[PDB]
C-alpha positions as a Markdown table, in Angstrom:
| # | Residue | x | y | z |
|---|---|---|---|---|
| 1 | Ser | 93.7 | 28.7 | 22.9 |
| 2 | Thr | 90.8 | 29.9 | 24.3 |
| 3 | Gly | 89.4 | 32.8 | 26.1 |
| 4 | Ser | 86.5 | 33.5 | 28.6 |
| 5 | Ala | 85.5 | 36.7 | 30.1 |
| 6 | Thr | 82.3 | 37.9 | 32.1 |
| 7 | Thr | 80.2 | 40.6 | 30.5 |
| 8 | Thr | 78.1 | 42.8 | 32.7 |
| 9 | Pro | 75.3 | 45.1 | 32.3 |
| 10 | Ile | 76.0 | 48.9 | 32.5 |
| 11 | Asp | 72.9 | 49.6 | 34.3 |
| 12 | Ser | 69.7 | 48.4 | 35.3 |
| 13 | Leu | 68.0 | 48.2 | 31.9 |
| 14 | Asp | 70.6 | 46.1 | 30.2 |
| 15 | Asp | 71.4 | 49.3 | 28.0 |
| 16 | Ala | 74.6 | 47.6 | 27.0 |
| 17 | Tyr | 77.3 | 45.1 | 28.4 |
| 18 | Ile | 80.9 | 45.8 | 29.2 |
| 19 | Thr | 83.7 | 43.1 | 28.9 |
| 20 | Pro | 87.1 | 43.8 | 30.8 |
| 21 | Val | 89.9 | 43.9 | 28.0 |
| 22 | Gln | 93.9 | 44.1 | 29.0 |
| 23 | Ile | 95.7 | 46.5 | 26.6 |
| 24 | Gly | 99.3 | 46.8 | 26.4 |
| 25 | Thr | 102.2 | 46.2 | 28.8 |
| 26 | Pro | 101.9 | 46.5 | 31.8 |
| 27 | Ala | 98.2 | 45.8 | 31.2 |
| 28 | Gln | 95.9 | 48.5 | 31.1 |
| 29 | Thr | 92.3 | 47.2 | 31.9 |
| 30 | Leu | 89.5 | 48.9 | 30.0 |
| 31 | Asn | 85.7 | 48.1 | 29.9 |
| 32 | Leu | 84.6 | 47.8 | 26.2 |
| 33 | Asp | 81.6 | 47.1 | 24.5 |
| 34 | Phe | 81.8 | 43.8 | 22.4 |
| 35 | Asp | 79.9 | 44.8 | 19.3 |
| 36 | Thr | 79.0 | 42.1 | 16.8 |
| 37 | Gly | 77.6 | 44.7 | 14.6 |
| 38 | Ser | 81.0 | 46.7 | 14.0 |
| 39 | Ser | 84.5 | 45.9 | 13.3 |
| 40 | Asp | 86.7 | 48.6 | 15.1 |
| 41 | Leu | 88.5 | 48.3 | 18.6 |
| 42 | Trp | 88.7 | 51.7 | 19.7 |
| 43 | Val | 89.3 | 53.3 | 23.2 |
| 44 | Phe | 89.3 | 56.3 | 25.0 |
| 45 | Ser | 92.8 | 57.5 | 25.3 |
| 46 | Ser | 95.3 | 60.0 | 26.6 |
| 47 | Glu | 94.8 | 61.5 | 23.0 |
| 48 | Thr | 91.0 | 61.8 | 23.5 |
| 49 | Thr | 89.9 | 65.8 | 23.7 |
| 50 | Ala | 90.0 | 66.3 | 27.4 |
| 51 | Ser | 86.4 | 68.0 | 27.3 |
| 52 | Glu | 85.0 | 64.9 | 25.9 |
| 53 | Val | 86.1 | 62.4 | 28.6 |
| 54 | Asp | 84.1 | 62.3 | 31.5 |
| 55 | Gly | 84.8 | 59.5 | 33.9 |
| 56 | Gln | 86.1 | 56.6 | 31.3 |
| 57 | Thr | 89.0 | 54.7 | 31.8 |
| 58 | Ile | 91.6 | 55.8 | 29.3 |
| 59 | Tyr | 94.5 | 54.0 | 27.5 |
| 60 | Thr | 97.9 | 55.8 | 27.5 |
| 61 | Pro | 100.0 | 54.1 | 24.7 |
| 62 | Ser | 103.1 | 56.1 | 25.8 |
| 63 | Lys | 103.0 | 53.9 | 29.0 |
| 64 | Ser | 102.7 | 50.7 | 27.1 |
| 65 | Thr | 106.2 | 49.2 | 26.3 |
| 66 | Thr | 104.7 | 47.0 | 23.7 |
| 67 | Ala | 102.6 | 49.9 | 21.9 |
| 68 | Lys | 103.7 | 51.0 | 18.3 |
| 69 | Leu | 102.2 | 53.9 | 16.3 |
| 70 | Leu | 100.8 | 52.6 | 13.2 |
| 71 | Ser | 102.2 | 55.3 | 10.9 |
| 72 | Gly | 99.8 | 57.3 | 8.8 |
| 73 | Ala | 96.8 | 55.4 | 10.0 |
| 74 | Thr | 93.6 | 57.1 | 11.1 |
| 75 | Trp | 89.9 | 55.8 | 11.8 |
| 76 | Ser | 86.5 | 57.5 | 11.8 |
| 77 | Ile | 83.2 | 55.7 | 12.5 |
| 78 | Ser | 79.4 | 56.6 | 12.6 |
| 79 | Tyr | 76.9 | 54.1 | 14.3 |
| 80 | Gly | 73.4 | 53.4 | 13.5 |
| 81 | Asp | 72.3 | 55.4 | 16.6 |
| 82 | Gly | 74.0 | 58.7 | 15.1 |
| 83 | Ser | 77.1 | 58.6 | 17.5 |
| 84 | Ser | 80.7 | 58.6 | 16.3 |
| 85 | Ser | 84.3 | 58.7 | 17.0 |
| 86 | Ser | 87.4 | 59.0 | 15.1 |
| 87 | Gly | 91.6 | 59.3 | 15.9 |
| 88 | Asp | 94.7 | 57.4 | 15.1 |
| 89 | Val | 96.0 | 53.9 | 15.6 |
| 90 | Tyr | 98.5 | 51.8 | 17.6 |
| 91 | Thr | 99.4 | 48.3 | 17.6 |
| 92 | Asp | 99.6 | 46.7 | 21.0 |
| 93 | Thr | 98.8 | 43.3 | 22.8 |
| 94 | Val | 95.3 | 42.8 | 23.7 |
| 95 | Ser | 94.0 | 40.0 | 26.0 |
| 96 | Val | 90.5 | 39.2 | 26.6 |
| 97 | Gly | 89.7 | 36.4 | 29.0 |
| 98 | Gly | 93.2 | 35.0 | 29.0 |
| 99 | Leu | 93.3 | 35.0 | 25.1 |
| 100 | Thr | 96.1 | 37.2 | 23.9 |
| 101 | Val | 96.7 | 38.7 | 20.4 |
| 102 | Thr | 99.8 | 40.6 | 19.7 |
| 103 | Gly | 99.8 | 43.3 | 17.1 |
| 104 | Gln | 96.0 | 44.2 | 17.5 |
| 105 | Ala | 95.2 | 47.4 | 16.1 |
| 106 | Val | 94.0 | 49.5 | 18.8 |
| 107 | Glu | 92.2 | 52.7 | 17.7 |
| 108 | Ser | 92.9 | 55.6 | 19.9 |
| 109 | Ala | 90.2 | 58.1 | 20.1 |
| 110 | Lys | 91.0 | 61.7 | 19.3 |
| 111 | Lys | 87.4 | 62.5 | 19.2 |
| 112 | Val | 84.1 | 61.0 | 20.5 |
| 113 | Ser | 80.5 | 62.2 | 20.5 |
| 114 | Ser | 78.4 | 63.5 | 23.3 |
| 115 | Ser | 76.7 | 60.1 | 23.7 |
| 116 | Phe | 80.0 | 58.3 | 24.6 |
| 117 | Thr | 81.3 | 61.3 | 26.6 |
| 118 | Glu | 78.0 | 61.0 | 28.7 |
| 119 | Asp | 78.4 | 57.2 | 29.0 |
| 120 | Ser | 81.1 | 56.9 | 32.0 |
| 121 | Thr | 80.8 | 53.0 | 32.1 |
| 122 | Ile | 82.0 | 52.4 | 28.6 |
| 123 | Asp | 85.9 | 52.9 | 27.7 |
| 124 | Gly | 85.4 | 52.0 | 24.0 |
| 125 | Leu | 84.4 | 49.4 | 21.6 |
| 126 | Leu | 85.6 | 45.8 | 20.6 |
| 127 | Gly | 84.1 | 45.2 | 17.2 |
| 128 | Leu | 83.2 | 41.6 | 16.2 |
| 129 | Ala | 81.8 | 42.0 | 12.8 |
| 130 | Phe | 83.7 | 40.9 | 9.7 |
| 131 | Ser | 86.9 | 42.9 | 9.1 |
| 132 | Thr | 85.7 | 44.2 | 5.8 |
| 133 | Leu | 83.9 | 46.8 | 7.9 |
| 134 | Asn | 87.0 | 48.0 | 9.7 |
| 135 | Thr | 87.5 | 51.8 | 9.2 |
| 136 | Val | 91.2 | 52.1 | 9.5 |
| 137 | Ser | 92.6 | 54.1 | 6.6 |
| 138 | Pro | 94.8 | 53.5 | 4.2 |
| 139 | Thr | 95.3 | 50.1 | 5.5 |
| 140 | Gln | 92.3 | 48.2 | 6.8 |
| 141 | Gln | 92.9 | 46.4 | 10.1 |
| 142 | Lys | 91.5 | 43.1 | 11.4 |
| 143 | Thr | 89.3 | 42.4 | 14.2 |
| 144 | Phe | 90.5 | 40.8 | 17.7 |
| 145 | Phe | 88.5 | 37.7 | 16.2 |
| 146 | Asp | 90.3 | 37.8 | 13.0 |
| 147 | Asn | 93.7 | 37.9 | 14.5 |
| 148 | Ala | 93.0 | 35.4 | 17.1 |
| 149 | Lys | 91.2 | 32.9 | 15.0 |
| 150 | Ala | 94.1 | 30.4 | 13.8 |
| 151 | Ser | 95.1 | 30.0 | 17.1 |
| 152 | Leu | 91.8 | 29.3 | 18.6 |
| 153 | Asp | 90.9 | 25.5 | 19.5 |
| 154 | Ser | 87.8 | 26.3 | 17.2 |
| 155 | Pro | 87.3 | 29.3 | 15.2 |
| 156 | Val | 84.1 | 30.5 | 17.1 |
| 157 | Phe | 83.2 | 32.9 | 19.6 |
| 158 | Thr | 80.0 | 32.7 | 22.1 |
| 159 | Ala | 77.6 | 35.3 | 23.5 |
| 160 | Asp | 75.7 | 34.4 | 26.4 |
| 161 | Leu | 74.3 | 37.6 | 27.7 |
| 162 | Gly | 72.4 | 38.1 | 30.9 |
| 163 | Tyr | 68.8 | 39.4 | 31.8 |
| 164 | His | 69.7 | 41.9 | 34.6 |
| 165 | Ala | 72.7 | 39.8 | 35.4 |
| 166 | Pro | 76.2 | 39.1 | 34.3 |
| 167 | Gly | 76.9 | 36.9 | 31.2 |
| 168 | Thr | 79.8 | 35.5 | 29.1 |
| 169 | Tyr | 81.8 | 36.0 | 26.0 |
| 170 | Asn | 83.8 | 32.8 | 25.1 |
| 171 | Phe | 86.4 | 32.4 | 22.5 |
| 172 | Gly | 87.6 | 29.3 | 20.8 |
| 173 | Phe | 84.9 | 26.8 | 22.4 |
| 174 | Ile | 81.3 | 26.1 | 22.9 |
| 175 | Asp | 80.5 | 25.3 | 26.5 |
| 176 | Thr | 78.1 | 22.7 | 26.3 |
| 177 | Thr | 76.9 | 23.6 | 29.9 |
| 178 | Ala | 75.8 | 26.9 | 29.1 |
| 179 | Tyr | 72.5 | 26.1 | 27.2 |
| 180 | Thr | 69.7 | 23.6 | 27.1 |
| 181 | Gly | 68.6 | 21.4 | 24.3 |
| 182 | Ser | 70.4 | 21.5 | 21.1 |
| 183 | Ile | 72.1 | 24.5 | 19.2 |
| 184 | Thr | 70.2 | 25.2 | 15.6 |
| 185 | Tyr | 72.8 | 26.7 | 13.3 |
| 186 | Thr | 71.5 | 29.1 | 10.4 |
| 187 | Ala | 73.1 | 30.4 | 7.4 |
| 188 | Val | 75.1 | 33.8 | 7.3 |
| 189 | Ser | 75.6 | 36.3 | 4.6 |
| 190 | Thr | 78.8 | 38.5 | 5.0 |
| 191 | Lys | 78.1 | 40.4 | 2.0 |
| 192 | Gln | 77.3 | 43.6 | 4.0 |
| 193 | Gly | 79.9 | 42.9 | 6.7 |
| 194 | Phe | 77.6 | 41.8 | 9.3 |
| 195 | Trp | 76.6 | 38.5 | 11.0 |
| 196 | Glu | 73.1 | 38.5 | 8.8 |
| 197 | Trp | 70.8 | 35.6 | 8.8 |
| 198 | Thr | 67.1 | 35.1 | 8.1 |
| 199 | Ser | 64.7 | 34.1 | 10.9 |
| 200 | Thr | 62.1 | 31.5 | 9.9 |
| 201 | Gly | 59.2 | 33.7 | 11.8 |
| 202 | Tyr | 57.7 | 34.8 | 15.2 |
| 203 | Ala | 54.7 | 34.5 | 17.5 |
| 204 | Val | 53.4 | 36.9 | 19.9 |
| 205 | Gly | 52.7 | 35.6 | 23.4 |
| 206 | Ser | 50.9 | 32.3 | 23.2 |
| 207 | Gly | 49.6 | 33.1 | 19.8 |
| 208 | Thr | 50.3 | 30.9 | 16.5 |
| 209 | Phe | 53.6 | 30.7 | 14.7 |
| 210 | Lys | 53.7 | 33.0 | 11.8 |
| 211 | Ser | 56.1 | 31.6 | 9.3 |
| 212 | Thr | 57.8 | 34.3 | 7.4 |
| 213 | Ser | 61.4 | 35.1 | 6.4 |
| 214 | Ile | 63.0 | 37.8 | 8.4 |
| 215 | Asp | 66.4 | 39.1 | 7.4 |
| 216 | Gly | 68.3 | 40.5 | 10.0 |
| 217 | Ile | 71.7 | 41.1 | 11.9 |
| 218 | Ala | 72.8 | 39.6 | 15.2 |
| 219 | Asp | 74.3 | 42.8 | 16.7 |
| 220 | Thr | 75.4 | 42.6 | 20.5 |
| 221 | Gly | 76.0 | 46.5 | 20.3 |
| 222 | Thr | 72.5 | 47.3 | 19.8 |
| 223 | Thr | 70.3 | 47.3 | 22.9 |
| 224 | Leu | 66.8 | 46.6 | 21.2 |
| 225 | Leu | 64.9 | 44.3 | 18.7 |
| 226 | Tyr | 64.3 | 46.2 | 15.7 |
| 227 | Leu | 61.8 | 44.3 | 13.3 |
| 228 | Pro | 59.5 | 45.2 | 10.4 |
| 229 | Ala | 56.6 | 47.2 | 11.2 |
| 230 | Thr | 54.0 | 44.4 | 10.5 |
| 231 | Val | 55.5 | 42.5 | 12.9 |
| 232 | Val | 56.1 | 45.2 | 15.6 |
| 233 | Ser | 52.6 | 46.3 | 15.3 |
| 234 | Ala | 51.3 | 42.9 | 15.8 |
| 235 | Tyr | 53.3 | 42.8 | 19.0 |
| 236 | Trp | 52.1 | 46.0 | 20.4 |
| 237 | Ala | 48.6 | 45.3 | 19.5 |
| 238 | Gln | 48.6 | 42.6 | 22.5 |
| 239 | Val | 49.4 | 45.2 | 25.2 |
| 240 | Ser | 46.6 | 47.5 | 26.2 |
| 241 | Gly | 47.2 | 51.1 | 25.8 |
| 242 | Ala | 50.5 | 50.6 | 23.7 |
| 243 | Lys | 51.0 | 53.0 | 21.3 |
| 244 | Ser | 53.6 | 54.6 | 18.6 |
| 245 | Ser | 54.6 | 57.8 | 19.9 |
| 246 | Ser | 56.5 | 59.9 | 17.3 |
| 247 | Ser | 57.6 | 62.6 | 20.2 |
| 248 | Val | 59.1 | 59.7 | 22.3 |
| 249 | Gly | 60.5 | 57.8 | 19.1 |
| 250 | Gly | 58.9 | 54.5 | 19.3 |
| 251 | Tyr | 56.4 | 52.2 | 20.7 |
| 252 | Val | 55.4 | 53.3 | 24.6 |
| 253 | Phe | 53.1 | 51.0 | 27.0 |
| 254 | Pro | 51.4 | 51.7 | 30.2 |
| 255 | Cys | 54.2 | 50.6 | 32.9 |
| 256 | Ser | 51.2 | 48.8 | 34.7 |
| 257 | Ala | 51.1 | 46.4 | 31.7 |
| 258 | Thr | 52.2 | 42.6 | 31.9 |
| 259 | Leu | 53.9 | 42.1 | 28.4 |
| 260 | Pro | 53.6 | 39.0 | 26.4 |
| 261 | Ser | 56.5 | 37.1 | 25.2 |
| 262 | Phe | 57.9 | 37.1 | 21.7 |
| 263 | Thr | 59.2 | 34.0 | 20.0 |
| 264 | Phe | 61.4 | 34.1 | 16.8 |
| 265 | Gly | 62.2 | 31.0 | 14.6 |
| 266 | Val | 65.9 | 29.9 | 13.9 |
| 267 | Gly | 65.2 | 27.1 | 11.3 |
| 268 | Ser | 62.7 | 24.7 | 13.0 |
| 269 | Ala | 63.6 | 25.8 | 16.3 |
| 270 | Arg | 62.0 | 28.6 | 18.6 |
| 271 | Ile | 63.5 | 31.1 | 20.7 |
| 272 | Val | 61.4 | 32.8 | 23.5 |
| 273 | Ile | 62.0 | 36.1 | 24.9 |
| 274 | Pro | 60.2 | 36.7 | 28.1 |
| 275 | Gly | 57.7 | 39.8 | 28.2 |
| 276 | Asp | 59.9 | 41.1 | 31.1 |
| 277 | Tyr | 62.8 | 41.5 | 28.8 |
| 278 | Ile | 60.9 | 43.7 | 26.4 |
| 279 | Asp | 60.3 | 46.4 | 29.4 |
| 280 | Phe | 62.9 | 49.3 | 29.3 |
| 281 | Gly | 61.4 | 51.2 | 31.9 |
| 282 | Pro | 59.7 | 54.7 | 32.2 |
| 283 | Ile | 60.5 | 57.0 | 29.3 |
| 284 | Ser | 61.6 | 59.5 | 31.9 |
| 285 | Thr | 62.1 | 59.6 | 35.7 |
| 286 | Gly | 59.0 | 59.0 | 37.2 |
| 287 | Ser | 56.7 | 58.5 | 34.2 |
| 288 | Ser | 54.1 | 55.9 | 34.1 |
| 289 | Ser | 54.8 | 55.5 | 30.3 |
| 290 | Cys | 57.3 | 52.8 | 29.6 |
| 291 | Phe | 59.7 | 52.2 | 26.7 |
| 292 | Gly | 59.2 | 48.9 | 24.5 |
| 293 | Gly | 61.9 | 46.8 | 23.7 |
| 294 | Ile | 60.6 | 45.7 | 20.2 |
| 295 | Gln | 60.6 | 48.6 | 17.8 |
| 296 | Ser | 60.2 | 49.1 | 14.2 |
| 297 | Ser | 63.2 | 48.9 | 11.8 |
| 298 | Ala | 61.3 | 50.9 | 9.3 |
| 299 | Gly | 64.0 | 53.8 | 8.3 |
| 300 | Ile | 66.9 | 52.1 | 9.8 |
| 301 | Gly | 67.0 | 49.8 | 6.7 |
| 302 | Ile | 68.0 | 46.7 | 8.2 |
| 303 | Asn | 66.3 | 44.6 | 11.1 |
| 304 | Ile | 68.5 | 44.2 | 13.9 |
| 305 | Phe | 68.5 | 41.1 | 16.5 |
| 306 | Gly | 70.0 | 43.3 | 19.3 |
| 307 | Asp | 70.5 | 42.6 | 23.0 |
| 308 | Val | 66.8 | 42.0 | 23.7 |
| 309 | Ala | 66.7 | 38.8 | 21.6 |
| 310 | Leu | 70.2 | 37.7 | 21.9 |
| 311 | Lys | 69.9 | 37.6 | 25.7 |
| 312 | Ala | 67.5 | 35.0 | 25.5 |
| 313 | Ala | 69.8 | 32.7 | 23.8 |
| 314 | Phe | 73.2 | 31.1 | 23.9 |
| 315 | Val | 74.5 | 32.5 | 20.8 |
| 316 | Val | 77.4 | 30.9 | 18.5 |
| 317 | Phe | 79.2 | 33.0 | 16.2 |
| 318 | Asn | 81.1 | 30.6 | 13.9 |
| 319 | Gly | 83.9 | 31.9 | 11.8 |
| 320 | Ala | 84.5 | 28.9 | 9.8 |
| 321 | Thr | 85.5 | 29.5 | 6.1 |
| 322 | Thr | 81.9 | 29.6 | 5.6 |
| 323 | Pro | 80.5 | 31.4 | 8.6 |
| 324 | Thr | 77.3 | 30.5 | 10.4 |
| 325 | Leu | 75.4 | 31.4 | 13.4 |
| 326 | Gly | 73.9 | 29.1 | 16.2 |
| 327 | Phe | 71.1 | 29.6 | 18.8 |
| 328 | Ala | 70.3 | 27.5 | 21.7 |
| 329 | Ser | 67.7 | 28.2 | 24.6 |
| 330 | Lys | 69.4 | 28.6 | 28.1 |
């Protein structure tokens, strides 16, 4: 089997992407944030504290003839950005782009933090990291990908995120028309439960490539590119007036600037992030100070190849017995 679904930016900055997901019988379609940095499929629901729901579409398990309470199971998650959610668990039928999994754990939120409430466009998350990170207790549950894998034509999914435009998540096949050149594959460590890999270096603009190993995660659920302070300083030093602002929480730059590109290495191959992808607009409405899309990972504890990086590529998440990651230009 295969599936193919369009993923759409939630706003004009590509802060996140939502993909429609069918849950239950009859289908209830929710727009979920596909997140290769976590492993829980959780939704706003009829059980979510009413004051914490503000415009989201909810899953109502009592209206699904295929929903079953997973007795005794609870979940609770905290994300790198400080947001969180928790609740109980149903199993139900879940379909993405024509690909159907029966018996998928659907984690129903009883509580969500303010960041989720305040974002009306995201009805929940669909985790695509390794199932070892799933938070369901006392019986850990599998991700949608893990459940689908054996049925897929090939045990892969691909992320093709757009810049200020829709893109695609495919399951079970590689669309050879969706990228240019060849796909370069690189080793993955699953030791921390992430799609963790090592970039071979970077360049800033038309500058020379610096060969250096950068361990990090491919994370569709993180907006920005978080890299070591040395790398980030070298990037922003090429933008007149750019500075790290402790009050804003990262590098800012004059909105009048033209940003240089940023290149990262995948083996001997190179992915080029155009400068415009690195512009996240005014820090507050009407400001002429703009927020940078490349930020320091210092104090996160891990480097993160988030949407800023991934949207410059066609990315293969290969879930073969030994997982690997593939990147192509597009």
